[model samples]
Target: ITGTSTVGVGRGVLGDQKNINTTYSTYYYLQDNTRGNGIFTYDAKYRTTLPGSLWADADNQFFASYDAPAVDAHYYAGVTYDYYKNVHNRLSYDGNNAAIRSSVHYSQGYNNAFWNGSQMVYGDGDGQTFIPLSGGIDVVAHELTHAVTDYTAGLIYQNESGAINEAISDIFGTLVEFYANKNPDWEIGEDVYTPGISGDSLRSMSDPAKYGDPDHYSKRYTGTQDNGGVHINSGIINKAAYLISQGGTHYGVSVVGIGRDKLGKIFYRALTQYLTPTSNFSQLRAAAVQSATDLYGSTSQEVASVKQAFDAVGVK
Candidate 1:
C-alpha cells in the first residue's frame, strides 16, 4: 500500500512492547518501506491460503490478542533484515533488496513455521507444543535464512544436501540471534517451543544429542523419514558450526574458537559462492575450508579451525 511510512507501538506474542513499521493509507498497514524494497506482514486467519490480507490496524496500535503474531512477524523480519544488511553487507535475503513478506496465524493448532519458497509463513501453535512461532527471533531468522539458501545455494531439499541446507539456516539463525543480542543461546526455538517447558528447544547446536540429534557424521541417520533425515542429520553440521564459533573438543578432536563473526563470514561465503545443489557433507567441509582460506589465508588459524571443526564432527 502506498502511503506515508509510519511506526506503530504493539505487543508481540510474548507480550513484550515493540515498535513496528507501518504505512498509513486510511488504515495502518504492516508495510515497512524503510527496509529494502519493503517488509510486509499478513494475517493468514487460520487458513492455508498463501499470503493473506496485509495486516491492518484501525488505530495504528496493535495490542489485541490476535495481533500478537502479526506484530512479531513484522518486527522480527525487520530485525533479521538488519542482521543481513548491517553485518554481511547483503541487502536482503536475495542480496538485492528484495521485498520481504511474512504471514502469521496460518492455521488452527498449527505448530510450525517455514519459508514457503515465495514468502515466510508462521503458525499459531495449539498452546502446547508452541505459541506464536514468530515470537522467537531465531525461529523467524531460521525461516528467512531458508529464503537466503533458496536464492543462493539452491541446495536440494533431500539427503545430505538437504541437511546442509537445514544447517545453513540454523547457523545463520543463531548468528542473527546473537546479532540481535537478546538472551542469545545455541538453542533453536526455545522461546516458542514447548512454552510450558523451561529448558528445552526444538534443537541444540551446542549439543545436538541433547534432543536426540547426532553431533557427528558417523551417526547420521540413513532412514527415508524427514527427506532422508534432513532435519535429523543436520545436527551433524550444526554441531560443527557450534564448535567452529565457540571452540570445543569433541571425540578427542579439538578446535580453537574463531568466534561467531568469522564463522558467519566463512559459512555465508560458502553458501553464496561455493555450495551447489548436490553438495554433501564432505563437499561442505571442502567449501568451508576453501571459504576460510579465501577470507583468512591457508595457514591462518581460521582455516585450521574450519578444518578441525569439520574433523571434530567427522565430516571428512
Candidate 2:
C-alpha cells in the first residue's frame, strides 16, 4: 500500500492513490486531465483535514486553507498599490515589479495579525473574542503597510523606531481605510472584535483615549510594553496624522487644519522617498512637515497642521 500524502500541500500531489490522506498536508490537490502533464495509473480517493494530528493542526491548516481571498485581499492590495502608484507614483511593494501576497486565516483563535517579510498573515480569531482578521479593511491594510515600512524606513522594531514603525502602519492603514470608505466611522478594527465588547474599535483615530486603556499615549506617554507599545503608543502618531489630515482642532483644543488628501500624500511621500531605518518621532515629524511644506508651500495650512500635530503629540 504505497499511499501518497497530499495533506496540507493541497490535492495536486495525490496522483492516483485511492486512499490519499490530506490531514497532515497544507495544500489542496486538483486532478488535471492534461495528457502531457502526467498520466494517472490508478483510481484516487481524496481525504482532507487540518494539517497536524495534535491541536496545532488546526492553526496550521487554518492559514494553509484560508488563502487570502483574491477579491478581499487583492482588493486592498490593489487599492494600496494604487494609492502608492497614483498618489506617490511608486511601483509595487519593493518599488519594482515585486508582487505582494497576503494570507488570511493565519492561526486559529489568534488574537493578533502581522506581516512576515514576504506576505501579510492574519488570524481566524478565537471566535469568542475576535473574528477573522480579514473582516476589517484596516487590519488588512495595516499588515500590508508593515511591508511598505519594511521596504522603506525599515524601522528597527525597538524603542522609538519600533513605535514609528507601528505608527507608520497606522497612518497608511487609516488612510487606506478612509480611501476605501468601507466603514463610515474612520476607526480601526471595528469589525474584527466582537461588538459585545465596550470599545468602538481596536484603535482610535479621533480619540485613542476613548478605549480608556492606560496604554494609550498621553502627554506623559512612556515606552514599555508591546515593543515600546508600538501598538499602543502608536495612537500618538495616529492621532497626529488624523488631526492633520482632517483639518481639525489639535486634541480638540487649538485650531489646526489641513486637507486630508494633502496630508496623506505628504506623509506617504516622506515615508517612502525620505526617512531611514533609524527614524524616530521627532525626525519623522520633521520630515513629514518639511515634505508638506516643500510639496505645498511654507505657508501652506497642510505644512502648519503637520507641524502642529507633531507638537500636539509632544514630539517637538
Candidate 3:
C-alpha cells in the first residue's frame, strides 16, 4: 500500500524555541508499526536535528525546536531553494531530486560556518561580539552556495582558482541576500558578527583593497591568509562583477550597459557552464565575454561592458 503522513508538535510542546531533534526514520514509524513483524522498513537516512545546544532539553524526547534562530534557518533555506528554482529553474543544489539539510547552532561559540560536501553547518557565535551565524540569511546562502560551487566549477581552493571559488560564493551570496531584501549594502557576513569593529566584514564586494593591507595584490595576498586568501582576494572579482552590473566608466573611459542582474547571470552561467577546474583569470575573462556575447549578442552594449569590466580589473 502507498500512503503519506504528516507529523507535527503543537505550540508549548517544544517551547517557543525553533529547533528539531527527530530522525527521518521516525517519520515512517506508523508505516513500520502497521506492517508488524519485519515485513516493512523505511530508510530515513536524513538527519534534521539542530545540534544539542539548540535542543529544548538535552535529555528530553525528540521534538522540533521553534525559536527565533530556527525560524531564520527555515526561512533562509526556503529563500535559497527558491532563488535557484525561480531564477535558474534548478530543481535543487544538485540540479536533481536531492534533498537539502541544514544544521544550526553547530558548535558552541564557533566563529564561522561552512558547508561539507553534503550538508550545511552553522555556528552560534561567541555572543559577545557576534551572534548565531544562522541568524542571517546571507550567511546561510553563502555557506550553501559553497555546495553549489563544489558541484559546479569545483574551483580549486588555491591561487586564482581559490579566489574564483570564493568570489562566486560572495557574488551569489550577496545576491541571495539582496534577493531576500536583507541588507542592501552588498556586504558579506555582516549579520552574524557584531558591528562594533570598524569596516570589519568577512569581505567587501565594493572594494577589496580596503581590507587588504599594503594596498596591493602582493604574492602574500594569496598565501598568508585564510585558505590562500581565497576569501581575501575574492574581492577583486567581486568588485569587477559589481562594476559590470552598475554601468560604471571603465578605467575612467568607456560606457557600459550591463546591469547588476544581467551581469551576475552571465558570470553565473560562465562559472557553471563554461569554466573548468584549471580555468584562470584570463580564461575566465574570455569565457565571460563570450558568454555575454552569446546571451546579449556580440555587438550588444552588455558584451562591451563585461569586457571593459574585466579589463578594468586587470583580468587581461
Candidate 4:
C-alpha cells in the first residue's frame, strides 16, 4: 500500500520491544519500504495459507504477542539483505534487489520455517519445540539463503547435492549471525529451538557429531529417508567448513585454520562461480579447492587448509 513511511515500535513474542518500519495511509501498516525494493511481512493467522495479507496495525506500534514474529521476520530479512550487499557485494538473493517477503503465524502448532520457493514462511512453534522461528536470526538467514542457492547454484534438493545445499544454508546462516554480531556462535537455531533445553541447538557446525550427525563421509547415511539424508549428511560438509574456519583434528586427520572471512570468500566464490544443480560431494571438494586457490593462491595456507578441511572430513 502506498503511504507515507513511518517508524513503529513493537514487542516480539519474547517481549522485546524494537522499532520497525511502517506505512501510514489508513492507520498504519507493517511494510518496510526502505531496503531492496521493500521488506514486507504478512500475518498468516494460524492457517495453512499463502502470503495472507500485508500486516496492518492500528497504530505504528505492535505490542501483541502475535505481532512479535512479524517484527523479527521483517527485521531479520533486512539484515540478511544487508549482509549480502555489504559483505558479498551482491544485491538481493537474485542479485537484482528483489522484494523480500515473509509470513508469520503460519498454521497452528507449526514446527518449521522455509523459503517455499518464493518468500520466507515462518511458523509459531508448538511452544515446546519452538516459540516462533523468526525470533532466531540464524533461522531467518537459513531460509533466506535457500533463496540465494535457488538463484545461484540451483543445487538440487536430494542426495549429495541436497546435502550440500543444506550445509550451505547452515554455513551462511552462521555467517549472518556473526555478521550481525549478536552473540554469534556456530550453533544453528539455538536461540529459538527447544526453549526447555539449554545449551542445545538444531545443529552444531562446530561439532556436527555432537547430535549424532556424521562429521565424516565414511559415517554418512546411504538410506532413502530424509531426502537421501540431506539434513543428516550435511554434517560432513559442515565439519569441513568448521575446520577451515577454525582448525581442528578430526578422528586422526588435522586441518589448519584460515579464519572466517577467508572461509566465506572461498565458499561464496564456489557457490556463485563453480557449483551446479547436480553437484555432488566430490564436485564440492573440487569447487572448494578451486575457490580457495583463486582466493589464496594454490600454495597459500588458506588453500591448503581448505583441502585438509575436506580431507579431515573423509571427503578425500
Candidate 5:
C-alpha cells in the first residue's frame, strides 16, 4: 500500500527499545519501504487466520503493550533482509526482491514459527516454552531461510531431504545472527526460547547433543513423527556446518576451520546450483566439496576443510 514513510519508536517483545519503519495514511501501519521491495508486518490477533489485520497506531510511536510483537516482527525482518543483501549479495528470500511478509501474535500460546510457503508466521509461546518468537532474531531468520531454501534447493520435506532442509535453515539463521553481530552465537532460538530457563536453546549447532539432538549419522532418527524427524536428524548437518565454520574434532575425526564467510559462500553456491529436492546427506557432502572446489579450488584448505567437516559429522 502506498503511504507516507515514517519512523516510529517502540519497545519490543523482550522489552528492548528500537525504532521501526512504518507507513501512514489514515493511521500508522507497520510497513517499511526501506528494505527490498518492502517489509509488511501484521497482527494475527490470537486467531488461526494469517495476517489478521494490519497493525495500526494512532501515533507514530508503538510502545503500547500489544504492539511489542509487531514491533519486533517488523524490525527483525529488516535485519534479516540486511544480512542477506549485505553479506550474500542476494535480494530478498526469492533472490528477486520479493515483498517480505510477516504476521505476529498468531494464536494464543502457539509456541512456534514457520515460513508457511508464503509469508512468515510467529506464535506467542506459552511463556514456559517461548515468548513472542520475533524477539529472537535467530528464530526470525531461521523461519525466513526456509523460504530461501524452498526457492533455491526445493528440498523435499520428508526423511533425509527434510532433514537437509531443516539444517539449511539453522545454518543460514546462525550466519545471519552472526552477521547482525548482536550477541552472536551458534545456538538457535536461545533469546526467545524459554525465559524460565537459562543458557539453553531449542538446539545448539555447536553441541546438538546438549539438547538431546544427535550430532552423528548413526544417531539419526528413523521415526515417522515430525515429518520423519526433519527437526531431529538435522543435528548431524548442523554439527557439520558448525565444524566447517569453527574447526573441531568429533568422534576422533578433525576438521580445519575455513571460517564463516567461506562456509556461507560454499553452502549458498551448493544450495543454488547443486542440491535437488531428493538430495540426501551423502549427496550434500558431495555438493559441499564440489562447491568448495568451485569457489576455492579442490587443493585449497577450503575444500579440505569442507571434506573434513562432513567426515567429522560421519557423513561418509
Candidate 6:
C-alpha cells in the first residue's frame, strides 16, 4: 500500500520492546518500505489460510496480545534481509529485491512455521511446546532462507537433497542470528521452543546427536519418514558446517576452524553457484570444496577445512 513510511513501537511475543517499520495511509499498516521492495506482515487470525489481512493498528501502537507475533515477523524479516544484503551483497531472496510477506497466528495451536513457496507462515504454538515462532529470529531466518534456497539452488525437497536444503536453512539461520547479535547460538528455535523448559531447542548444530539427529553420515536416517528424513539427516551437514566454523575433531577426523564469516562465504558461494536441485551429500561436499577453493585458493586453509569438515562428518 502507498503511504508515508513510519515507525511503530511494540513488544514482541517474547515480551521485548522493539521498533517496527509501518506505513500510514488511513491507519498504521505493517508495511515496511525501507528494505528491498517492501516487507509486509499479515494476521492469519488462527485460520489455515494464506496471507490474511494486512495487520493494521488504530493508534500505531501494537501492544495487544494478538499483535506480538506480527511485530516479530515484521521485524525479523527486515533483519534477515539486512543480513543477506549487507553480508552477501545480495539484494533480496531473489536477488531482485522481491517483496517479503508473512502471516502469523496461522491455525489454532499451530506448532510450526514455513515458507509456503510464495510467502511465510508462522504458528502460535500451543504454549506447552512453543510460543509464537517469530519470537525466534532463527526460526524467522530459517523460514526466509528457504526462499533463498528456492531461488538459488532449488534443492529438491526429498532424501539427501532435502536434507541439504534443511541444513542450508539452519546454517544461514544461525548466521543471521549471529549477525543480529541476539543471544546467538548454534541451536535452532531455542528462543521459541519449550518456553517452560530451559536450554533446550528444536535442533542443535553444535551437537545434533544430543537431540537424536545424526552428526555423521554413517548415522543418517534411511527411513521414508519426514520426506525421507529431511530434518533428521540434515544434522550430518549441519555438524559439518559447525565444524567448519568452529573447529573440532569428530570420529578421529579433525577440521581446522576458519571462523564464521568465511563459512558464510563458502556456503553462500556453493549454494548460489554450484549446488543444484538434485545435489546430494557428496555433491554438497564437492560444491563446498570448490567454493572454498575459489574464494580462498586451492592451497588455502579454507579449502583444506572444507575437505576436512566433510571428511570429519564421514561424507565423501
Candidate 4 lDDT by residue in tens digits, 168-192? 9999999999999978999999989
The sequence of per-residue lDDT tens digits that candidate 2 reaches over residues 1-316 is: 1223332321111111122122222322221122112111111111122121111133222233333221244345556666666666667667764655555444456777677786665556676667666556677777878887888878888767787788778777777777777554547788767746755677777777776422223543465767766666677777777777675555444437666677778888888777888888888888897899788899987777787777676677
lDDT of 5: 0.92
RMSD of each: 0.6, 10.1, 7.3, 1.0, 0.9, 0.5
* Residue pairs of candidate 1 with colliding backbone atoms: none
In order, what lDDT does every prediction score?
A: 0.95, 0.60, 0.62, 0.91, 0.92, 0.96
Which residues of candidate 3, in runs, are more than 4 Å off?
Answer: 1-66, 195-200, 213-220, 249-257
Model 3 residue 310 lDDT score: 70
Q: For model 2, where is the 10-residue window of minimal lDDT? A: 38-47
Q: Rank by lDDT, descending?
A: 6, 1, 5, 4, 3, 2
Model 1, span 83-187: residue lDDT tens: 999988999999999999999999898999999999999999999999999999999999999999999999999999999999999999899999989899999
Model 1 alpha-carbon miss at residue 73, Å: 0.6
Regions more than 4 Å wrong, model 5: none
Residue lDDT tens for model 5, 194-215: 8998988999999999999999
Q: Predict model 1's lDDT versus the native.
A: 0.95
Can you list the residue pairs that collide in candidate 3?
A: 17-66, 17-67, 18-65, 18-66, 18-67, 19-64, 19-65, 19-66, 20-64, 20-65
Error of 2 at 220 (Å): 4.8
Model 4 segments beyond 4 Å from truth?
none
The C-alpha TM-scores of every prediction are 0.99, 0.74, 0.76, 0.98, 0.98, 0.99
* TM-score winner, 2 or 6: 6
| Of candidates 6 and 4, the better by lDDT | 6
Q: What digit string (tens of lDDT, one per residue) describes model 6 on residues 1-316?
A: 9899999999999899999999999999999999989999999999987889999898889889999999999999999999999999999899999999999999999999999999999999999899999999999999999999999999999999999999999999999999999799999999999998999999999999999999999999999999999999999999999999999999999899999999999999999999999999999999999999899899999999999999999999
